[PDB]
Design an enzyme around this catalytic site. Structure first.
Site, mmCIF file in Angstrom:
data_model
loop_
_atom_site.group_PDB
_atom_site.id
_atom_site.type_symbol
_atom_site.label_atom_id
_atom_site.label_comp_id
_atom_site.label_asym_id
_atom_site.label_seq_id
_atom_site.Cartn_x
_atom_site.Cartn_y
_atom_site.Cartn_z
ATOM 1 N N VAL A 292 -21.144 78.347 5.378
ATOM 2 C CA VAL A 292 -21.115 78.075 4.250
ATOM 3 C C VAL A 292 -20.617 78.728 3.140
ATOM 4 O O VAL A 292 -19.898 78.390 2.208
ATOM 5 C CB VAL A 292 -22.777 77.773 3.960
ATOM 6 C CG1 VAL A 292 -22.836 77.333 2.439
ATOM 7 C CG2 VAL A 292 -23.378 76.445 4.864
ATOM 8 N N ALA A 293 -20.485 80.124 3.456
ATOM 9 C CA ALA A 293 -20.124 80.899 2.456
ATOM 10 C C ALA A 293 -18.426 80.911 2.473
ATOM 11 O O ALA A 293 -17.838 80.873 1.373
ATOM 12 C CB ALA A 293 -20.364 82.477 2.643
ATOM 13 N N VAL A 295 -16.095 78.598 3.879
ATOM 14 C CA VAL A 295 -15.520 77.252 3.666
ATOM 15 C C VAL A 295 -15.738 76.967 2.247
ATOM 16 O O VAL A 295 -16.549 76.998 1.568
ATOM 17 C CB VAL A 295 -16.289 76.179 4.484
ATOM 18 C CG1 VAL A 295 -15.914 74.716 3.860
ATOM 19 C CG2 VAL A 295 -15.732 76.445 5.998
ATOM 20 N N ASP A 339 18.149 49.568 -1.931
ATOM 21 C CA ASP A 339 18.496 48.281 -1.838
ATOM 22 C C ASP A 339 19.450 47.962 -3.206
ATOM 23 O O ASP A 339 18.943 48.657 -4.380
ATOM 24 C CB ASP A 339 17.535 47.326 -1.786
ATOM 25 C CG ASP A 339 17.877 45.915 -2.082
ATOM 26 O OD1 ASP A 339 18.816 45.385 -1.414
ATOM 27 O OD2 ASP A 339 17.185 45.052 -2.900
ATOM 28 N N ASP A 680 13.364 45.814 -3.614
ATOM 29 C CA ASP A 680 12.729 44.846 -4.448
ATOM 30 C C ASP A 680 12.451 43.552 -3.387
ATOM 31 O O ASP A 680 11.540 42.721 -4.009
ATOM 32 C CB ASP A 680 13.178 44.498 -5.713
ATOM 33 C CG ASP A 680 14.642 43.442 -5.309
ATOM 34 O OD1 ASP A 680 15.388 43.690 -4.544
ATOM 35 O OD2 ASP A 680 14.725 42.379 -6.087
ATOM 36 N N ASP A 684 13.556 44.329 2.513
ATOM 37 C CA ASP A 684 13.164 46.009 2.486
ATOM 38 C C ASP A 684 11.903 46.244 2.964
ATOM 39 O O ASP A 684 11.558 47.440 3.129
ATOM 40 C CB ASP A 684 13.136 46.199 0.896
ATOM 41 C CG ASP A 684 14.319 45.784 0.399
ATOM 42 O OD1 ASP A 684 15.345 46.315 0.836
ATOM 43 O OD2 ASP A 684 14.399 45.406 -1.062
HETATM 44 F F1 ALF Z 1 20.753 44.825 -1.795
HETATM 45 AL AL1 ALF Z 1 19.301 44.063 -1.185
HETATM 46 F F2 ALF Z 1 17.674 43.437 -0.804
HETATM 47 F F3 ALF Z 1 18.759 43.638 -2.959
HETATM 48 F F4 ALF Z 1 19.774 44.704 0.180
HETATM 49 MG MG LIG Z 2 17.186 42.113 -3.998
HETATM 50 RB RB LIG Z 3 -17.852 78.717 -0.106
HETATM 51 RB RB LIG Z 4 13.117 39.753 -4.947
#
Ligand code: ALF
Ligand SMILES: [Mg+2]
Ligand SMILES: [Rb+]
Ligand SMILES: [Rb+]
Ligand SMILES: CCCCCCCC/C=C\CCCCCCCC(=O)OC[C@H](COP(=O)(O)OCC[N+](C)(C)C)OC(=O)CCCCCCC/C=C/CCCCCCCC
Ligand SMILES: CCCCCCCC/C=C\CCCCCCCC(=O)OC[C@H](COP(=O)(O)OCC[N+](C)(C)C)OC(=O)CCCCCCC/C=C\CCCCCCCC
Ligand SMILES: CCCCCCCC/C=C\CCCCCCCC(=O)OC[C@H](COP(=O)(O)OCC[N+](C)(C)C)OC(=O)CCCCCCC/C=C\CCCCCCCC
Ligand SMILES: CCCCCCCC/C=C\CCCCCCCC(=O)OC[C@H](COP(=O)(O)OCC[N+](C)(C)C)OC(=O)CCCCCCC/C=C\CCCCCCCC
Ligand SMILES: CCCCCCCCCCCCOCCOCCOCCOCCOCCOCCOCCOCCO
Ligand SMILES: CC(C)CCC[C@@H](C)[C@H]1CC[C@H]2[C@@H]3CC=C4C[C@@H](O)CC[C@]4(C)[C@H]3CC[C@]12C
Ligand SMILES: CC(=O)N[C@@H]1[C@@H](O)[C@H](O)[C@@H](CO)O[C@H]1O
Ligand SMILES: *[C@@H]1O[C@H](CO)[C@@H](O)[C@H](O)[C@H]1NC(C)=O
Ligand SMILES: *[C@@H]1O[C@H](CO)[C@@H](O)[C@H](O)[C@H]1NC(C)=O
Ligand SMILES: *[C@@H]1O[C@H](CO)[C@@H](O)[C@H](O)[C@H]1NC(C)=O
Ligand SMILES: *[C@@H]1O[C@H](CO)[C@@H](O)[C@H](O)[C@H]1NC(C)=O
Ligand SMILES: *[C@@H]1O[C@H](CO)[C@@H](O)[C@H](O)[C@H]1NC(C)=O
Ligand SMILES: [Rb+]
Ligand SMILES: [Rb+]
Ligand SMILES: [Rb+]
Ligand SMILES: [Rb+]
Ligand SMILES: [Rb+]
Ligand SMILES: [Rb+]
Lengths: 987, 262
Positions: A292-293, A295, A339, A680, A684
């Site tokens: 206890v001490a 940890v 991407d 996006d 992806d």
């Molecule tokens: F450049 Al992309 F899905 F937007 F590969």
């Molecule tokens: Mg895209």
């Molecule tokens: Rb402790």
């Molecule tokens: Rb998209």
């Protein structure tokens, strides 16, 4: 056989392969058999481990388990001690309980770190049609989409989503959106023609979940369910094994160090205990006390409070995290894979260049119009602008005057949409201008004509002429021109002009841009009176010998903040790779535009065309940049991909499959990279799941893209990545400060027990009081080190070596544990013997005193002066011991948190007081202290005593010593950056 | 190598051992300074000693406090109680008291110079015969054989503590719960009234009065019934003695279970 080959089969073979008809479809019976063989045409949802089995794992861990054991010993002791009717200590109950609270409260911190708590396949089967029309036994009807089976004959149309992976047998002007595969919403043609080796590129395969934009087609179902290309993208996302974030790895490593030390300390003294004659049951209780001490009960709590406050800070820059771990990773990231479309770029076709007056001009393609424009004084230009404005059929939806022009939604293809937006940006109101020149006649863009034309009344009342305006493919616009506008005058299109044109056309072609020509022809009133009847089917007007005006080219351009963000990252030592499904030429242009490819970088292909030598003789090392298409990637070996990554520091991967994105991320990982991924799109999601951190755009992002992400840029401002890098590098630097501060006080909570056991002095520091220090008094100070600023220029430093630069290392642990911690225990013991002696117990009397001290049959024990003492009076004096030891540690935690503010820099330059939150934490520290001491009742609830002013003073020289010691230490490393002193004593 | 080279291991050891010696030196010095801070005769503070504890003999503890039980009919059940009672009294024999002196003042025995031998102060005699019927003579069974036993009440000593001047501090034993069926606890105390003479105060500490011995008072219980369990509370009535503390049952009083079997 997972792979589609059905694009390269004849109907005879496809019919034989599937025992189906290309015109009558499957027999109703065989359909329902096949449905039982393959199951439904659906994606299987891999059950995430149930919600409460998630909470159970949080309860386990090196530190969590020691608490369990200790709470169990407390129960066992409580039971054994109460099974003999001893009602005197319920401490071992409350000790047991508090521990369990800590275990559970800690495990709650761990579980609520994951705010999102969601499954990806939810978004994937929101991309999937519910119905389909199918033909079986030559009867077309609408079936449920899930009932389709390989071999089915399926009819698609515009507006509907494609019900399975289809091998197309006949098509009528049919176009699809394959962005879920490529990230590119540009429509693609579907025919029955076999147009590529890959089924991802051929025209006669249509893909489950893609949207059929227009036309109709029929085709054979060659895959269903998780076998479809969308089902494999989904599997790759779900099936990514759940690897540990960089900071989870760090936390686990430090925990392993602590738990190992705790078992070693606890176990060696249990032996020592038994060796100097304690009973096993008592040594078992010492093992619990030492655990206890040593940890740090509050540690994991403090760590996630620090992460919480970084998450808070990121979120105010519109950067939203889904799990507190994700708040550190961009600081440790050393390769970004990004991407291209909708992440780096705006996902909007924008006018980019113009060829007129024999020169290429550059349009301002930023969304905020924050860029550099082109010269518009020209009268050739005033003319080209007239043409691209009149010869356009797209439209702004109404009431959009509050909207920024780029954001405005318009009715038209991407191309005309861009031209119209470009015209309203250049001139006030394109639709108003166009109405002033009423369209007398028009022929829309055609497949046979291969251009678009219209003729217009002019605006001047006096002017009775009719102006013809036309656009189309540049070569094919130009083969209908006789003259050209150049510097106001109009010249015959001589050979030298035609060649000039061709070079401009191919030039913009080389920038990965779409290109259009634009010509005009003014019609006199002599051959065409004011009310002449322009008949399209007659062609009563000319369509040759027109006047060329200019080329216009367009691209999906970078988002405004994206190119600076990229340089900042590279400046911070992070490699940046483009990984896009788009076409290489566009990808390379955009890589250059955004800074992924430095000005002056050549590929081996670049070099080969300058030196006019074949590429196979270009020395691969000489090329800083590299562009690898998916087909090449498919052809490569892993050693070759690694060889490429090592060789060309500026890397572009174009025309990549979703799996290929994963395979690039992983390749970097195996090489030693902590890899972030910015995307996006649906394609992806595997790359997102597999990065160490995945960042999605909040606005242009796809659901699947946001679902697989760890972090979300709510305003789509890519520059937020740069912020994340910084906050991550800060939080890491500051966590070792809290961790160092929180660990260092463990040693003076330990040593009192080690002495108590081996020297049988009255117990200096009890458990209840440790927990108060661990979970209460020092919690705020340790957290306040989160607010500490950077000692160095953090953004110019390289990303930390994940293998040798760790959150807690032996130098940090040893120094804090055995030096600062050691000084703190000598302070404690100094105040202990001080308060004992001033109360009648000289130190030599304390050695071996414990048995009589702790004896309830001994109500008249004599102290150094001969004074007789009850067990009660002794007990309260033991509490006074606990308290002086407590405030020795507190006074040192003031010195401690001050010297932790900096690891390199002296406290005399950065000062003591610039961190405001830390001083309030110090003051709250001392207030919660005085309360515990001088609040009445406190001796009987929490074992705390109203000590005298003198015993607060006692440990101050030790605190001051700590400051002076560390200050001297830090100066040693500033003045000797290579020396032994620096080597061994820097943490 | 187990983390460094064989010469890097020696240079860190030398530093840590140096660090530890210096810190042990600083500590040893602090303790030494502390001990010339300390006067060997009078403690610096008396925070936990506001009121003196009280103890009794013979001390036999069950669970939860003092429990005393014996059979009058069997001499061997009270033998040990007699034995501890006699063995306790040995330090109060006339020869054991050779270092103390005759005190007659019946007032506080204030001494400022150390006129006693070896530069000490005089301490007052208390001889076992001052307990009379409970001295072990003529009855060496200390009241037990006859079912009317003596318990000796000793007040914990505290340097320079003065219990109040108006009279001497007195013992009173009564039943804790007056039995509805019975009469109050009838007790005769030796010395008369059950007082501690004033000249046993102040205590000046073991160094100044090495031969000091606590005055005693015996509480001869006369009333107590046979084969019933009772509880006896003996409080010290003195101006500056309190017995109200709920976290210290032995502060200013002592209580014990008693059962006298037959
Ligand atoms: F450049 Al992309 F899905 F937007 F590969
Ligand atoms: Mg895209
Ligand atoms: Rb402790
Ligand atoms: Rb998209
Ligand atoms: C990893 C390795 C760590 C190594 C740590 C080693 C710790 C040990 C360090 C020092 C040892 C003790 C030094 C004692 C110094 C004595 C100085 C001195 O001359 O004083 C005098 C007293 C005797 O009094 P007197 O007879 O004069 O009084 C009569 C009253 N008058 C004075 C009025 C006349 O001498 C005395 O007390 C002698 C008895 C001393 C009492 C021993 C107490 C034991 C407690 C030890 C705890 C230490 C914890 C250290 C924390 C380290 C963190 C890692
Ligand atoms: C990797 C694992 C390594 C393991 C290392 C082991 C090495 C140490 C082994 C042995 C040390 C030598 C032992 C000395 C000779 C025996 C002394 C002895 O017989 O004492 C026994 C006493 C218990 O009987 P008692 O007199 O209290 O009974 C009182 C009864 N009642 C309470 C009813 C009144 O012990 C008590 O409980 C109270 C203490 C009083 C006696 C002092 C003994 C202290 C001596 C040494 C301790 C030092 C250990 C340091 C190791 C540190 C390693 C980092
Ligand atoms: C994470 C890193 C943390 C590092 C900390 C590791 C701690 C490991 C250290 C272990 C050291 C254990 C030392 C054990 C010393 C035992 C001394 C002893 O058992 O000796 C006996 C006498 C005590 O008096 P006595 O027998 O009359 O009391 C009994 C009176 N009766 C008989 C009437 C009942 O000792 C004497 O004379 C004077 C002896 C002075 C002893 C000073 C001890 C200070 C040592 C270390 C600190
Ligand atoms: C790198 C430089 C950093 C350190 C330099 C400064 C250290 C020395 C400077 C000042 C010392 C005093 C600091 C102010 C706080 C007072 C602490 C204290 O007063 O501490 C003295 C204790 C014993 O307290 P006392 O009986 O004198 O209280 C007297 C209370 N009244 C007067 C009401 C009866 O003994 C002790 O700590 C030992 C006293 C001897 C001085 C050794 C310093 C060891 C530091 C490590
Ligand atoms: C680089 C710097 C390193 C050095 C670190 C320096 C840090 C400085 C921190 C400042 C700390 C301030 O400390 C405040 C100390 O408070 C002491 C309170 O003193 C009380 C003393 O009185 C003794 C108590 O007596 C007990 C009996 O009380 C009866 C009388 O009480 C009066 C009413 O009070 C009721 C509660 O006791
Ligand atoms: C002070 C006396 C009594 C104890 C001497 C024991 C020696 C062997 C101990 C005491 C301090 C210890 C060191 C404390 C600090 C460090 C530096 C750290 O990075 C690794 C462990 C290491 C190197 C320890 C090795 C063993 C060590 C040198
Ligand atoms: C007055 C009184 O009680 N005296 C007795 C006497 O027996 C003894 O000789 C004297 C020592 O001087 O002290 C005692
Ligand atoms: C100190 O005085 C006492 C008197 O009680 C005597 O018995 C003892 O022998 C003396 N001790 C020394 C060392 O002189
Ligand atoms: C004390 O002893 C005297 C002398 O024998 C005797 O008369 C008296 O009754 C005794 N008191 C008690 C309570 O036994
Ligand atoms: C009691 O004590 C004080 C000082 O000790 C003294 O002045 C006072 O007169 C004494 N009272 C009695 C009643 O003797
Ligand atoms: C104390 O005993 C005396 C006899 O010396 C007696 O007069 C007095 O009443 C007793 N005190 C009390 C309070 O009973
Ligand atoms: C006391 O002892 C006698 C015989 O020695 C026995 O008969 C009697 O029952 C005992 N008293 C009790 C309460 O047990
Ligand atoms: Rb067949
Ligand atoms: Rb549009
Ligand atoms: Rb006109
Ligand atoms: Rb991830
Ligand atoms: Rb991962
Ligand atoms: Rb009183």
């Amino acid at each position: 056989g997972m792979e589609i080959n059905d694009h390269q089969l004849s109907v005879a073979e496809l019919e034989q392969k599937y025992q189906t008809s290309a015109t009558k479809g499957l027999s109703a019976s065989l359909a329902a058999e096949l449905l039982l063989r393959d199951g439904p045409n659906a994606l299987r949802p891999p059950r995430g481990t149930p919600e409460y089995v998630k909470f159970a794992r949080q309860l386990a861990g090196g530190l969590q388990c020691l608490m369990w054991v200790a709470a169990a010993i407390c129960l066992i002791a409580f039971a054994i001690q109460a099974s003999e009717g001893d009602l005197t200590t319920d401490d071992n109950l409350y000790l047991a309980l508090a521990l369990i609270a800590v275990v559970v409260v800690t495990g709650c911190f761990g579980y609520y770190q994951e705010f999102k708590s969601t499954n990806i396949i939810a978004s994937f089967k929101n991309l999937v049609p519910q119905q389909a029309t199918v033909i079986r036994d030559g009867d077309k009807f609408q079936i449920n989409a899930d009932q389709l089976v390989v071999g089915d004959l399926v009819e698609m149309k515009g507006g509907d989503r494609v019900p399975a992976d289809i091998r197309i047998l006949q098509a009528q002007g049919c176009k699809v959106d394959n962005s879920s595969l490529t990230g590119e919403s540009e429509p693609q043609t579907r025919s029955p023609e076999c147009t590529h080796e890959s089924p991802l590129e051929t025209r006669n395969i249509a893909f489950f979940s893609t949207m059929c934009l227009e036309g109709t087609a029929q085709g054979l179902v060659v895959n269903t369910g998780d076998r479809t290309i969308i089902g494999r993208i989904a599997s790759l996302a779900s099936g990514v094994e759940n690897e540990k974030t960089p900071i989870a790895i760090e936390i686990e490593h430090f925990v392993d160090i602590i738990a190992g030390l705790a078992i070693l300390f606890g176990a060696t003294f249990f032996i020592v205990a038994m060796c100097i004659g304690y009973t096993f049951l008592r040594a078992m209780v010492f093992f619990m006390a030492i655990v206890v001490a040593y940890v740090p009960e509050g540690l994991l709590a403090t760590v996630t409070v620090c992460l919480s406050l970084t998450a808070k800070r990121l979120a105010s820059k519109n950067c939203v995290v889904k799990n507190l771990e994700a708040v550190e990773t961009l600081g440790s990231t050393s390769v970004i894979c990004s991407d291209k479309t909708g992440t780096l770029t705006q996902n909007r076709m924008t006018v980019s260049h113009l060829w007129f007056d024999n020169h290429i001009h550059s349009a301002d393609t930023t969304e905020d119009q924050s860029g550099q424009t082109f010269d518009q004084s020209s009268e050739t230009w005033r003319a080209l602008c007239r043409v691209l404005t009149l010869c356009n059929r797209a439209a702004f939806k109404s009431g959009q005057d509050a909207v920024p022009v780029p954001k405005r939604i318009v009715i038209g293809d991407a191309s005309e949409t861009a031209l119209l937006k470009f015209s309203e940006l250049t001139l006030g109101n394109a639709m108003g201008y166009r109405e002033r020149f009423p369209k007398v006649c028009e022929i829309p863009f055609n497949s046979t004509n291969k251009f678009q034309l219209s003729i217009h009344t002019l605006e001047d009342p006096r002017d009775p002429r009719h102006v013809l305006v036309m656009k189309g493919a540049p070569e094919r616009v130009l083969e209908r021109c006789s003259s050209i506008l150049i510097k106001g005058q109009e010249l015959p299109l001589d050979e030298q002009w035609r060649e000039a044109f061709q070079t401009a056309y191919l030039s913009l072609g080389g920038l990965g841009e779409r290109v259009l020509g634009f010509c005009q022809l003014y019609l006199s009133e002599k051959d065409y009176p004011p009310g002449y009847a322009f008949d399209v089917e007659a062609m009563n007007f000319p369509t040759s010998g027109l006047c060329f005006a200019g080329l216009v080219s367009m691209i999906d351009p970078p988002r405004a903040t994206v190119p600076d963000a990229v340089l900042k990252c590279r400046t911070a030592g992070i490699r940046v790779i483009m990984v896009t499904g788009d076409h290489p030429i566009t990808a390379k242009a955009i890589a250059a535009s955004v800074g992924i490819i430095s000005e002056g970088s050549e590929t081996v292909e670049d070099i080969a065309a300058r030196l006019r030598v074949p590429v196979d003789q270009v020395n691969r090392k000489d090329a800083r940049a590299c562009v690898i298409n998916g087909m090449q990637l498919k052809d490569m070996d892993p050693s070759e991909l690694v060889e490429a990554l090592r060789t060309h520091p500026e890397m572009v991967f174009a025309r990549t499959s979703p799996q290929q994105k994963l395979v690039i991320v992983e390749s970097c990982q195996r090489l030693g990279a902590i890899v972030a991924v910015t995307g996006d799109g649906v394609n992806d999601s595997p790359a997102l799941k597999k990065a160490d951190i995945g960042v999605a755009m909040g606005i242009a992002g796809s659901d699947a893209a946001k679902n697989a992400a760890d972090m979300i840029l709510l305003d789509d401002n890519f520059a937020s990545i740069v912020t994340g890098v910084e906050q991550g590098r800060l939080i890491f630097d500051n966590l070792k400060k809290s961790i160092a501060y929180t660990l260092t006080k463990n040693i003076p909570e330990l040593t009192p027990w080690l002495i108590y056991i081996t020297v049988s002095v009255p117990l200096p520091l009890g458990c209840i009081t440790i927990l108060f220090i661990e979970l209460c008094t020092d919690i705020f100070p340790s957290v306040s080190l989160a607010y500490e600023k950077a000692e160095s220029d953090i953004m110019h430093l390289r990303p930390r070596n994940p293998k040798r630069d760790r959150l807690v290392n032996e130098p940090l642990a040893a120094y804090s544990y055995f030096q600062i911690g050691a000084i703190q225990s000598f302070a404690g013991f100094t105040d202990y013997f001080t308060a004992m002696a001033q109360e009648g117990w000289f130190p030599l009397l304390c050695v071996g005193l414990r048995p009589q001290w702790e004896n309830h049959h001994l109500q008249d024990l004599q102290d150094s002066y001969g004074q007789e003492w009850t067990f009660g009076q002794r007990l309260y004096q033991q509490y006074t011991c606990y308290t002086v030891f407590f405030i020795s540690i507190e006074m040192c935690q003031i010195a401690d948190v001050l010297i932790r503010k900096t690891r390199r820099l002296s406290a005399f330059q950065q000062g003591f007081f610039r961190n405001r939150i830390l001083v309030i934490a110090i003051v709250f520290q001392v207030c919660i202290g005085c309360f515990l001491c001088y609040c009445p009742g406190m001796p009987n609830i929490f074992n705390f005593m109203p000590i005298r002013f003198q015993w607060w003073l006692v440990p101050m020289p030790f605190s001051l010593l700590i400051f002076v010691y560390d200050e001297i230490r830090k100066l040693g490393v500033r003045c000797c950056p290579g020396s032994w002193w620096d080597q061994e004593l820097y943490y | 190598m187990l983390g460094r080279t064989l010469s890097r291991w020696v240079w860190i050891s030398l530093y840590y051992v140096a660090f530890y010696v210096v810190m042990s030196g600083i500590f040893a010095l602090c303790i030494y300074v502390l001990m010339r801070t300390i006067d060997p005769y009078t403690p610096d503070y008396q925070d936990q000693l506001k009121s003196p504890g009280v103890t009794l003999r013979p001390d036999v503890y069950g669970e939860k406090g003092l429990d005393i039980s014996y059979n009058v009919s069997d001499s061997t059940t009270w033998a040990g109680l007699a034995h501890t009672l006699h063995r306790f009294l040995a330090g109060y024999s006339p020869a054991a008291q050779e270092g103390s002196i005759n005190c007659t003042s019946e007032k506080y025995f204030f001494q400022e110079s150390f006129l006693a031998p070896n530069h000490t102060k005089f301490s007052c005699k208390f001889t076992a015969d001052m307990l009379q019927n409970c001295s072990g003579r003529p009855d060496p069974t200390f009241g037990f054989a006859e079912g009317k036993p003596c318990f000796i009440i000793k007040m914990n000593r505290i340097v320079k503590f003065l219990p109040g001047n108006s009279t001497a501090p007195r013992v009173d034993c009564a039943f804790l719960d007056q039995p509805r069926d019975g009469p109050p606890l009838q007790v005769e105390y030796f010395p008369a009234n059950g007082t501690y003479s004033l000249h046993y105060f102040p205590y000046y500490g073991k160094k100044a009065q090495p031969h000091y011995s606590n005055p005693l008072v015996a509480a001869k219980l006369l009333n107590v019934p046979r084969n019933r369990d009772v509880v006896i509370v003996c409080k010290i009535l003195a101006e500056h003695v309190s017995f109200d503390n709920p976290h210290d049952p032995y502060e200013g009083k002592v209580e014990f279970k008693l059962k006298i079997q037959k």
